[PDB]
Amino acid sequence: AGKKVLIVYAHQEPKSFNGSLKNVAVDELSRQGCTVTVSDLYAMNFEPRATDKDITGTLSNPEVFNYGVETHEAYKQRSLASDITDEQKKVREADLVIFQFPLYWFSVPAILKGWMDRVLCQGFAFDIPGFYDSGLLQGKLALLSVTTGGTAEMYTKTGVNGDSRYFLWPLQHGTLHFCGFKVLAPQISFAPEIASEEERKGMVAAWSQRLQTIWKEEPIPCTAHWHFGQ
Amino acid sequence: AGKKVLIVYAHQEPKSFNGSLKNVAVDELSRQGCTVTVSDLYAMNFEPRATDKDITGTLSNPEVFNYGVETHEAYKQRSLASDITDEQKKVREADLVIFQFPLYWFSVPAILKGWMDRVLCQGFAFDIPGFYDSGLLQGKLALLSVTTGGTAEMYTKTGVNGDSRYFLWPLQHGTLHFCGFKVLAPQISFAPEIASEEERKGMVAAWSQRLQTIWKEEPIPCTAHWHFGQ
Numbered sequence: 292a293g294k295k296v297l298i299v300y301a302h303q304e305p306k307s308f309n310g311s312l313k314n315v316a317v318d319e320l321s322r323q324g325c326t327v328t329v330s331d332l333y334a335m336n337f338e339p340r341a342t343d344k345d346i347t348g349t350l351s352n353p354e355v356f357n358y359g360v361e362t363h364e365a366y367k368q369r370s371l372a373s374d375i376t377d378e379q380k381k382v383r384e385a386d387l388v389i390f391q392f393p394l395y396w397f398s399v400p401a402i403l404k405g406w407m408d409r410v411l412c413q414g415f416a417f418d419i420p421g422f423y424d425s426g427l428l429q430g431k432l433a434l435l436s437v438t439t440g441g442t443a444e445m446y447t448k449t450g451v452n453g454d455s456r457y458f459l460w461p462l463q464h465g466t467l468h469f470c471g472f473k474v475l476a477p478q479i480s481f482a483p484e485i486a487s488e489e490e491r492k493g494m495v496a497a498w499s500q501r502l503q504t505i506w507k508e509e510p511i512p513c514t515a516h517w518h519f520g521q
Numbered sequence: 522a523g524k525k526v527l528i529v530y531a532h533q534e535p536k537s538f539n540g541s542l543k544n545v546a547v548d549e550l551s552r553q554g555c556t557v558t559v560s561d562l563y564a565m566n567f568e569p570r571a572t573d574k575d576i577t578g579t580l581s582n583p584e585v586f587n588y589g590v591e592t593h594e595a596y597k598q599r600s601l602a603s604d605i606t607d608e609q610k611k612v613r614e615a616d617l618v619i620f621q622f623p624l625y626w627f628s629v630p631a632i633l634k635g636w637m638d639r640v641l642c643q644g645f646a647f648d649i650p651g652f653y654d655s656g657l658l659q660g661k662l663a664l665l666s667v668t669t670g671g672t673a674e675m676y677t678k679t680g681v682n683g684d685s686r687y688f689l690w691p692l693q694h695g696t697l698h699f700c701g702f703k704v705l706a707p708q709i710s711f712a713p714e715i716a717s718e719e720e721r722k723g724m725v726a727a728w729s730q731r732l733q734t735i736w737k738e739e740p741i742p743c744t745a746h747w748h749f750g751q
């Protein structure tokens with residue numbers, strides 16, 4: 292109150308553990324009086340590919356297609372495809388953006404990668420030059436809520452997967468920080484599929500409990516040191 | 522040399538710098554007498570989304586859709602969508618897989634993320650157990666050939682982007698090593714859009730020239746220490 296939250300959600304199945312985490316987020320933030328909007332990417336059949344269809348009308352150089360250039364020019368000339376601009380409006384209005392997704396290959400599912408690629412365009416999310424703290428979304432908070440197959444033990448420095456902080460870098464630092472977001476600590480729900488039906492309840496409740504005081508949190512220091520150092 | 526190479530290529534524009542690096546790879550490996558295949562993802566309109574359309578058989582749990590479970594089962598039964606099995610055949614026969622792409626948000630473009638999500642399914646690329654050094658694609662080589670916006674100086678330990686190896690972790694370790702690939706050293710072509718005509722020519726020829734001796738290289742040690750140091 293008054294805050295707007297966007298949840299960008301990437302799971303195929305409403306009954307999934309990801310689905311429950313998104314639904315608990317909506318319930319709790321709605322209870323607090325927050326304005327809440329969900330981009331359900333799979334349900335939207337959201338387009339992940341960066342193509343020339345992302346620019347309507349005619350191209351600033353139709354001899355050689357350079358996605359970054361064309362989308363930058365399209366943004367400034369209000370000529371982007373409406374799926375993209377619809378998302379940009381939600382992001383522009385949001386105080387907090389939560390990404391809710393299963394880890395796919397130490398990263399976001401391709402549908403959500405496509406949302407980052409196509410929604411966070413130069414002119415909108417950053418300029419060249421125009422980034423990290425010179426980055427256009429400054430003032431906003433972002434938070435990754437990730438589920439994994441691997442256990443917390445696997446996700447340690449000398450575990451097989453390495454520290455979870457290591458896979459966070461391209462998302463938190465290369466993407467969210469670059470665009471100016473302040474980054475709240477990741478929520479990581481380790482290994483729901485190997486249960487139990489009570490540790491699972493416990494993970495959902497912990498996320499619900501944490502959303503209670505989310506506006507009280509300070510952002511992480513989004514540095515090489517936080518991700519890799521001691 | 523008597524080897525099969527698959528190049529998975531992710532750029533919209535044939536006259537691009539990526540397009541040039543892909544063609545010099547084809548020209549050079551072809552000159553050597555290697556068998557060469559390119560999956561040009563945008564030209565194929567490759568589907569990046571992990572959906573229930575990827576399975577054509579009776580689902581193992583049609584009440585709650587779990588993509589990993591259903592694709593693992595579909596792989597064993599041969600009920601995967603044929604676009605996926607077409608790619609698996611390329612990978613299965615390849616001795617070396619080269620990925621040629623521009624860096625998008627410290628990672629692969631979503632279209633290529635989708636190829637990794639959908640093509641490297643359980644049963645085919647790994648099993649549980651059967652990953653990392655026991656991955657199912659053991660004996661195969663993989664190499665990332667990546668172009669950036671950011672300069673080499675930006676991609677250093679104390680540059681704004683951090684070391685370039687930091688962003689390689691989810692792709693080299695989390696994906697290729699997990700599937701059992703031995704990983705060759707990345708080719709990184711920094712900031713070609715900024716570069717002079719001659720520096721650009723020199724980056725293309727350094728790749729061509731490296732490929733002349735590719736079959737003699739050893740893989741990297743794909744470990745936390747290699748990627749992060751200390």
Ligand SMILES: Cc1cc2nc3c(=O)[nH]c(=O)nc-3n(C[C@H](O)[C@H](O)[C@H](O)COP(=O)(O)OP(=O)(O)OC[C@H]3O[C@@H](n4cnc5c(N)ncnc54)[C@H](O)[C@@H]3O)c2cc1C
Nearest residue numbers: 307308309311393394395396397438439440441483491589
């Ligand atoms: C292409 C691909 C790549 C992957 N790469 C990685 C990787 O790099 N690293 C890694 O660690 N893992 C990886 N995984 C595994 C993936 O991250 C996990 O499968 C995923 O995060 C599981 O979350 P989910 O929502 O799908 O679980 P679900 O299967 O949907 O749920 C787990 C259980 O919770 C139940 N549930 C639903 N709601 C509730 C509720 N409120 N209370 C209690 N239980 C509930 C479900 O019924 C289910 O039994 C990959 C998977 C795929 C398909």
Ligand SMILES: Cc1cc2nc3c(=O)[nH]c(=O)nc-3n(C[C@H](O)[C@H](O)[C@H](O)COP(=O)(O)OP(=O)(O)OC[C@H]3O[C@@H](n4cnc5c(N)ncnc54)[C@H](O)[C@@H]3O)c2cc1C
Nearest residue numbers: 359537538539541623624625626627668669670671714721
């Ligand atoms: C959505 C998005 C996200 C991005 N995220 C990142 C990121 O996280 N980090 C980062 O560093 N960068 C990022 N970038 C920038 C991106 O990586 C670069 O734009 C891309 O790597 C440049 O490669 P290219 O093939 O498109 O260059 P091009 O624009 O195609 O090439 C530059 C020049 O080389 C010329 N050329 C082509 N062939 C030859 C040849 N044979 N010899 C000499 N010159 C030739 C071309 O004509 C052109 O003039 C991002 C870009 C986008 C669009």
Ligand SMILES: Cc1cc(=O)[nH]c2c3c(ccc12)OCO3
Nearest residue numbers: 396440441442445452589695699
């Ligand atoms: C890289 C990785 C680490 C892990 O711990 N679990 C995984 C998994 C996958 C694919 C990849 C991983 O599918 C099911 O579970």
Ligand SMILES: Cc1cc(=O)[nH]c2c3c(ccc12)OCO3
Nearest residue numbers: 359465466469626670671675682
């Ligand atoms: C994250 C990042 C680092 C960088 O150095 N350059 C970038 C770039 C982009 C998008 C992101 C980046 O579009 C053009 O250039």
Ligand SMILES: [Zn+2]
Nearest residue numbers: 464468513514
């Ligand atoms: Zn940062």
Ligand SMILES: [Zn+2]
Nearest residue numbers: 694698743744
């Ligand atoms: Zn490794």
